[PDB]
């Protein structure tokens, strides 16, 4: 990793756990969803070692330090959605009926069904995701996809719509999809725990993929923020 090992695998579009270390740049970004250094703006160098620990490390709690994986913000059981609610919250997400059990940031906020009268407060930019699944298949489970991403980011995620009101999901070249998402922070009240832009959200997802703590049941290749 410091010299002479796996240089032929750095940036090879295939994640190799043997090369997944900060020294080898998370296998040249292949293990961090194409995010070079998710901690690039983090002021303390050893934060990634404390990212995975299930405890608050205040020195690593800044937005630049990826909120110490929300362990300072969500200190107790509220860190995760109840496993008994997994199917229920995915089935009832954004169905136009307020489901109180799902009405928490860790469960996906019920896809905002309990906050229809609160105006959208979008983060800057668009979250772009390459998923190795065709658009039709991806949209067949779109509620599950958005609910899970909303639960992970602890905020509300939705498909960016075009002028014709259609979801901005494009074919990837037959082999996958290029998914465009917006982040609605209308329920994200602020210390800090809210992504101000799409790149911040992409870096956080890259940091989870880097420490092997991203459990998203979709063939997600890469993430980026775009204006």
């Amino acid at each position, epitope marked *: 990793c410091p010299r002479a090992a796996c240089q032929a695998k750095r940036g090879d579009q295939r994640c190799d756990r043997e090369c997944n270390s900060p020294g080898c740049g998370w296998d040249g970004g292949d293990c961090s969803l194409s995010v070079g250094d998710p901690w690039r703006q983090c002021e303390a160098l050893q934060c990634w070692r404390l990212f*995975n620990n*299930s405890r608050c490390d205040p020195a690593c709690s800044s937005p630049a330090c990826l909120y110490d994986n929300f362990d300072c913000h969500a200190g*107790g*059981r509220e860190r*995760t959605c*109840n*496993p*008994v*609610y*997994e*199917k*229920y919250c995915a089935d009832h997400f954004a169905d136009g009926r307020c489901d*109180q*059990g799902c009405n928490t940031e860790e469960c996906g906020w019920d896809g905002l069904d309990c906050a229809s009268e609160v105006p959208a407060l979008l983060a800057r930019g668009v979250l772009v995701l390459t998923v190795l699944l065709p658009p039709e298949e991806l949209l067949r489970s779109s509620a599950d996809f958005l609910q899970r991403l909303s639960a992970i980011l602890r905020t509300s995620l939705r498909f960016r719509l075009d002028a014709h009101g259609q979801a901005m999901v494009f074919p990837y070249h037959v082999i996958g999809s290029v998914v465009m998402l917006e982040i609605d922070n209308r329920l994200c009240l602020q210390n800090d725990h809210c992504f101000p832009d799409a790149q911040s959200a992409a870096d956080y997802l890259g940091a989870l993929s880097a420490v*092997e*703590r991203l*459990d998203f049941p979709y063939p997600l290749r890469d993430v980026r923020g775009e204006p």
Partner: antibody
Amino acid sequence: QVQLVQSGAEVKKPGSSVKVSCKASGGTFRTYAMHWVRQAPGQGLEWMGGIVPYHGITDYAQKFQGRVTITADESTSTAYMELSSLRSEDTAVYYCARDDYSTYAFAYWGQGTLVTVSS
Amino acid sequence: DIQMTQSPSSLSASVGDRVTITCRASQSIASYLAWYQQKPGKAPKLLIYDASNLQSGVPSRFSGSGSGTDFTLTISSLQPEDFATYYCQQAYKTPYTFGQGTKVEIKR
């Protein structure tokens, strides 16, 4: 102090139904879950399903689909497990288990209810 | 389902021995793993929750470690009241699943 008290031992003929109850007391956490775990004689532990009485949301193990019904009465902090079309292989001790404010793991357990299914 | 594999299934040890029981999950469960103790004719008892948190009232000679797919229950200075069956349980995704159990007997 949290305490879980279950209904008494049951004896049933094959094809009959059983409904077991579990009363929780001493709890302060509103969104606690009540689970049903069974243990056949000399065997391990098997989760059947669970409920959060405050929200009424339930989840079951697929192998118990159609035969198990889990309900609760939030006002009495009581959970129920109903198991239908009883077979001799359903003979087991049925435990009620509850989590707490700090984990989803089974922090509290009832004393168990033996259900014997036989001719 | 997530399959939980415990090792050993049976263990003979003496009072004062340092005992290790391992639990392997079929897929990663992060740190969402609990350890239970069960004695004959009694209900299980929670010892450790979420891989490494010792339940209050449980002696400090019990400790849990691991993350991902591999977990360890360590009993330092095994005491007479520790002879029992131990189970690991993933609390990560439903259906909640348990290991097959490790029966700990006293050598004599």
